[PDB]
């Protein structure tokens, strides 16, 4: 583990004008205390999940939601952005941004913790959307998140928010199954893939080699799980994950670095080796 983290730091110091793409999953938010929508519990939500959902993921299915918004509403209450403090790993992303070495973070999480830790909106790509905004599912009119958040406080929750223009259901801009993923996801990955193949030279007579770091995901859900094998072979991949998964398990590459480590301790150790503790510590205390 510490040797692998050493190599990541050494690569970054050998390529100081190169940037890093992160691809992340639910594992980077577990230390924040965010419930897993699949896990049991005591709330109204777990009662509804057990009684009303034909399968766990239907809480995110747009056809189910139209027939019965209550399960999703009760889940949004427990995932409410603002409840949870971003993790050390989330702040590592902000630190890389401050150091100008964050190319992008592709996140499968809806919790908005990357943005809340201070990562810029244009550096975040959401594979399932997020709670950042609300929209009508029928016509697309933008709503202030506050209107949806007001309903979440009612006891009980009834009279779900409806569009004042067309009367259809309003919900956070999470991409539900049955909804199209925005064009910006695929076009951003197209552009960033092209950048991963680019020859970028600055200091000396050598290119600035980038890096892709995959963290806290089991790489079992498609289409997101297709991205790691789409990283060019000539670009070094890191997997920081409690288990080896996805393309790192089947078609491991000679240059792959696999680190079985918790995301928060990986961040501490990486910052350790990079010599960025002082900058990192200021960010953690401010937020
Ligand atoms: N501290 C730690 N440090 C390092 N690694 C850690 C760690 N703690 C755990 N791990 C490793 O973290 C991995 C977690 O894997 P897991 O499959 O749970 O999450 P995922 O992101 O890959 O899921 C992809 C999608 O699956 C769907 O259910 C869910 O869809 C939605 O939310 C969704 C929402 C709205 C609309 C539509 C969909 C999700 O977005 C495991 O390998 C653990 O070993
Ligand atoms: Zn509408």
Residue numbers in the entry: 8 to 294
Quote the original article.
We also tried to crystallize the ternary complex composed of Hst2, benzoylated substrate, and cofactor NAD+, but the solved complex structure at 1.8 Å only showed the density of 2’-O-benzoyl-ADP-ribose, the cofactor product. We presumed that the ternary complex initially formed and reacted, producing 2’-O-benzoyl-ADP-ribose that remained bound while the debenzoylated substrate and nicotinamide dissociated. The appearance of 2’-O-benzoyl-ADP-ribose also suggests that the debenzoylation process utilizes a similar catalytic mechanism as deacetylation catalyzed by NAD+-dependent HDACs. In both structures, Hst28-294 exhibits an elongated structure containing a large Rossmann-fold domain and a small zinc-containing domain. The small domain consists of four α-helices (α3-5, α9) and three β-strands (β4-6). Both the H3 peptide and the cofactor product bind to the cleft between two domains. The superimposition of two structures by the large domains shows a 17° rotation of the small domain and the rearrangement of the α2–α3 loop involved in contacting the 2′-O-benzoyl-ADP-ribose. Such rigid body rotation might be facilitated by four glycine residues serving as hinges located at junctions between the large domain and the small domain.
